[PDB]
């Protein structure tokens, strides 16, 4: 069971937001802690992706491109898993120190996005997603969004992604047809959610820049340099259906 040994071995542990839960829930304080949490999780996503079977086959620039396009889908998918297992999804478990209740969903001004994220979370229960299935699905998310113009070595990407699909099929097989349909439909459903949060993240970065409040450095760079390629359609998700 080589492949699964690796995914479970490299899975990131707890990541705290740094949030001061004793100060009031303002828009500013909630988003400052969300953004800091993003910066911190980005570190772990980079280290996780580089340790994935086959990932270093990819040209070095494609390695960074793929991380820099898929991070939102990956982080939302993982957050949904955390929510499912820790508060069974009527709250959002961004981090142990940053759990969103309904009030925080409203004061962050992202209630409707949180409602979709909460729906994604609950699907882990509706579909009875196993830990092995979650891990394989999350790895596939890294290979599920690319420039329409292709990567520097697209061929290696296409083969690696093929191999991760084969692994997803393996864990299922180890009816199977309905299960693969269900899981590929779930995967496809992550991307519209990611896109909404990408739009949100971009809009807030412009607005906070207007009033001279800075995002953490990597978040500011990815949201100003890479996210707009997604919002403008130069980078697109790869769907199953
Ligand atoms: C990825 C994060 C942080 C990590 C996580 O668990 C999911 C969550 C999804 C919303 C993102 C947030 C990082 C900061 C963002 C991008 C804010 O700018 C607006 C939307 C937030």
Curated annotation (Swiss-Prot):
- Reported effect, residue 221 to A/Q: Reduced transcription activation in the presence of androgen
The positions annotated for binding 17beta-hydroxy-5alpha-androstan-3-one are: 35, 82, 201
TM ranges: none
Instruction: Report the outcome of residue 220 to T.
Output: In prostate cancer
The record lists the effect of residue 33 to G as: In PAIS and AIS
What effect on the protein does mutating residue 219 to T have, as reported in its record?
In AIS; low androgen binding and transactivation
Q: What is the effect of changing residue 55 to L?
A: In a patient with severe hypospadias
Annotated effect of mutating residue 73 to V? In PAIS and AIS
Effect after changing residue 233 to E: In prostate cancer
Give, from the UniProt record, the effect of changing residue 79 to I: In prostate cancer
Q: Which residues pair up as cystines?
A: none
Q: What is the effect of changing residue 215 to L?
A: In prostate cancer and AIS
**Additional notes on this entry:** In the absence of ligand, steroid hormone receptors are thought to be weakly associated with nuclear components; hormone binding greatly increases receptor affinity. The hormone-receptor complex appears to recognize discrete DNA sequences upstream of transcriptional start sites. Transcriptional activity is enhanced by binding to RANBP9.
Q: Domain text from the record?
A: Composed of three domains: a modulating N-terminal domain, a DNA-binding domain and a C-terminal ligand-binding domain. In the presence of bound steroid the ligand-binding domain interacts with the N-terminal modulating domain, and thereby activates AR transcription factor activity. Agonist binding is required for dimerization and binding to target DNA. The transcription factor activity of the complex formed by ligand-activated AR and DNA is modulated by interactions with coactivator and corepressor proteins.
Q: Which family is this protein grouped under?
A: Belongs to the nuclear hormone receptor family. NR3 subfamily.
Q: What is this protein called?
A: Androgen receptor
Q: Which species is listed as the source?
A: Homo sapiens
Which gene underlies this protein?
Answer: AR
